[PDB]
Amino acid sequence: STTEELAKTFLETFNYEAQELSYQSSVASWNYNTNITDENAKNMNEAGAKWSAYYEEQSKLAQTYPLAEIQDAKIKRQLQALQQSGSSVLSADKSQRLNTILNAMSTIYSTGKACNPNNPQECLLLEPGLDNIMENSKDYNERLWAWEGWRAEVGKQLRPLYEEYVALKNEMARANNYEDYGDYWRGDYEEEWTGGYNYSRNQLIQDVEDTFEQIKPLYQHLHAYVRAKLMDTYPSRISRTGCLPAHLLGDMWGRFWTNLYPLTVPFGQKPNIDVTDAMVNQNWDARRIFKEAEKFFVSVGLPNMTQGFWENSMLTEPGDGRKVVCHPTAWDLGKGDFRIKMCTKVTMDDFLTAHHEMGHIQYDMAYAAQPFLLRNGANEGFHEAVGEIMSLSAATPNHLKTIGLLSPAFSEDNETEINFLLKQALTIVGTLPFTYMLEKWRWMVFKGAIPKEQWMQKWWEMKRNIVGVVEPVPHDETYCDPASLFHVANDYSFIRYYTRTIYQFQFQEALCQIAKHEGPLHKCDISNSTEAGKKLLEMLSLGRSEPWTLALERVVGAKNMNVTPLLNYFEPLFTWLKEQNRNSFVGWDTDWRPYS
Template identity: 35%
Template sequence: MKTLVSLAALAASLVAAPALAQQAPDAALNDAAPNAAAAQAWIKAADQGYFDQTVRTGRTQWVYETNITDDTEALFAASNAEFNTLMVKTAAEAARMAKVPGLTAEDQRKLVMMRTQITSPVPTTPGAAEEFGTRQARIQGLYGKGHGTLNGAAINGSDIEEAMGTSRNPDQLKEMWLSWHDSVGKPMKDDYAKMVALSNAGAQELGFADTGALWRSNYDMDPAAFAALTEKIWNEVRPLYVQLHCYTRSKLNEKYGAGVQQKSGPIRADLLGNMWAQEWGNIYDVVAPKGSGDLGYDVGELLVAKDYDAVKMVKAGEGFYTSLGLAPLPETFWARSQIVKPQGREVICHASAWDIDNKDDLRIKMCTKVNGDDFVTIHHELGHNYYQRAYNAQTSRYYMEGANDGFHEAIGDTMALSITPEYLVQIGLMGRDKVPAADKDTGLLLRQAMDKVAFLPFGLLIDRWRWGVFDGSIKPDNYEAAWNQMRLKYQGLVPPAERPADAFDPGAKFHIPAVVPYTRYFLARVLQFQFYEAACREAGWKGPLHRCSFYGNKAVGAKLNAMLSMGASKPWPDALEAFTGSREMSGKAMIRYFAPLQKWLEKQNKGQDCGW
């Protein structure tokens, strides 16, 4: 996940914000009819103020997430309010400036971005920003310090994630799932509902119907058209998901019996190897095809055999990017990153990538374990860092973002798709004589699908649920029921036990208390296959697409960096076209990648009652 700089600000900013950023917006507000020159001066000042504020923001957020205490929580809350106040004030004035005649198209683009890049708008009423910041800091603290239980003993969030992936005891899985959701999600429900009300009031002050409409306005297209586009993409890939769901359900039924998992209908969510059932790869051993299910290698075992530790894993990830001709990470990255979980203090282990100074103070924050999942995560997070550095020469801080937020997530995922046997040979983790034969391809594709395809409906429904919360169609007393209905509709899943009306299972997912829009991850799952297919085509790869590695290809690196360096300075279709040749986001590249698997799944599922 790319860190969102709108969540906090440097403690020093609580005393005084930059004079230029404060004075210029106020001066414009007192001007009844600013001319183009005055508006352009305001845009320049506001841009610089945003730049300076994000630097302060990053520092306080980093301190809080890497050392959760009452003091850092208080600083986080106050700085969050400070930043939100500045963002809302800037957005409100940007709406007025947009009406000034004589502005250039670039001026207008910046003004649009000033209005739509607010994740958590708050109203300008006294105390609203402070209340929002306090509540958000509190619920993020609940998440960061959250624990579940295993066999009755407390277990922290990082360890419970690992245990959910390895346990095959349905009673243990049920216990961990229920204890985590009850202890983390339920206590934050009231705070979350009040944050929604505050956020909606802020969005309405900016001219949006609600916060969801504001979020959807940040995609260079009409909000309704964007919602329709995501639904169109989902319908392109849904048939593949249904086949994967059907096959997985039958394998779970074979393993656990009908008393745990029925042959038909939805799947019990805690059986899928992940606390949120967002990715299912951890239960590949349960679903592996007979005779060809053994992939012939395990990345985690290869790492251990080669004496990799967490730092060496990150070095390997860096090596992928430098092999494409991109520069090594700065020395400060190694000195300042949190690569492993520190002892003796509470931290947020959720992996994230940071650009503290909008220049080259790049960092990652992880609680890395030596396993295949974290090897993939490292490649993903470094994709954010290399994107951040590629666009740091843009003239506007508002352009120092991905072409859209799905792009930012997709870059690292594209590199992770290249963690193929060929790549493992290239970096010395696997001998060429150990590369799996072609008869392993079904297993290789199925293992990928258990993460990539299984994620799609989850990636879509998080914001579908929040859009309903924001527009009022989902009321607080119906939060839990609507959540479970939506998980059933899109994922075909049910919780392991009946959930009470006062539960708040959405809050047990990091991005809900952190107020991080989630559609980006759905888009990233789609875009990564478009990027990967384009990279393999550029590299001249001739074999099966799912075995492609473009490691070491400088031509791919040059083309990639050209797209990355555009940042958000152009509409996302321009960036997409620069690398792929197409201006359309589509699930078709993913379907082509998994076409052999889909045919195989349909054969395995013959006679089954697929769907739920």
């Protein structure tokens, strides 16, 4: 016997019980999320614990098969996943402390609240209180309240915890042979493959910066346009050359400028395309919404949903007493069980969501033949990009017209084209500098390049320099405003959304050139393009079995993150911004602040 053959057989006996326990968990986890009972909650955590227990044990047993003696990648990448220790490399001291901190920060984030200076009895929790304020309030002071209050009554509470979190996460990474906790997170993109499909952890740093340096032109002219259409409201509060106040950006942090659309829509007269009314007028239901999405993937050569999908999924809020947190989810439970958990309403946004979520299933179904540990997105951003391009194709006037939602009336104009691309940019283009800057900060925090007595001082310097966003209130080192965002407080890497955003437009463009699509990329419906569906399946069915650098290449023909498909998606808006900003200042002086 050989340490590889021994590894295979070990992975055989692992892949059996794992796929068993992982199913048991996924079902027990499904049964809670669709029935939310304290009783099913126990079963979910128990099956999740039997599953975690097995994984923890097998991880230890797996390390005994040295990866240096493995040649089969299907075994190497499987072994690599199991062999990674994680927090189990710390002493039970550090681990118990790290969990205490992590669960503290998660609890401080959710249970935390901020109270009005005007009404100190109105202590409003973020969800849904302060979020409604940030997402809907046009009042500068009401928005300023929540933003500063959240970053103080919560962000400060997390400051001592995050300092410990960074230290205990570093010790975990360094003891796992990583430069810091940031280099640990970047290891997702690390591929030690042959054929130039290798990828360094540090290569992500350069790649993300180099691609952002090309989003900058888009962002500046989005910034100068948002700054101007913002300056209409809040007039004296936004400098024509200064940065944007952080509390005036939609989300509590400025992550998604999606809610600035009412204050920034180019030609507000031209109404949005909303086939929601068309769906009601045709007595559509949730099953119809998903049957159309199924037809969509089938048109492009992807399989239909399994029978177990239709008779097990939750495509409607169950009702009765059966509580279910209404949020779209796509379940790859295992053993061919594919399910979608969605409180589907007969709307356009849930129609697009149904295609997005069914994209996840297509990805989950495609790699089901892969070994269990490889049944995943090629990297952390792959699985979401595959979903996003499903809503991109389904949202176009072409697909809406061919399905009878948008009437055969050939709508669209040079104005509604700009309106939609402006709406997209606020969501997709706006988040990218926010995402790079936040994750760049954590990387330098983990690297040690930012002393703790300068965390906030370096954060807002980066916020102004890179995001063009300035704090309405100066923040000393008692604040931890990054920690006031969920992923930072809840220990989730964030470069996923940056990478995923670049990927999806690489995906869409590659499939649309395959689809013989003539015209602007944002108008492309990959429907009936079975040639595009094949290149997708060639990558979807890979799972994590092959490097993302190669998996990406089976769609887009490049081994890396290329931002030019994203720019080409917004070149119509880019050129229109350069003209609607011709006499405007494109850039930002980082020394201006609304507090003088």
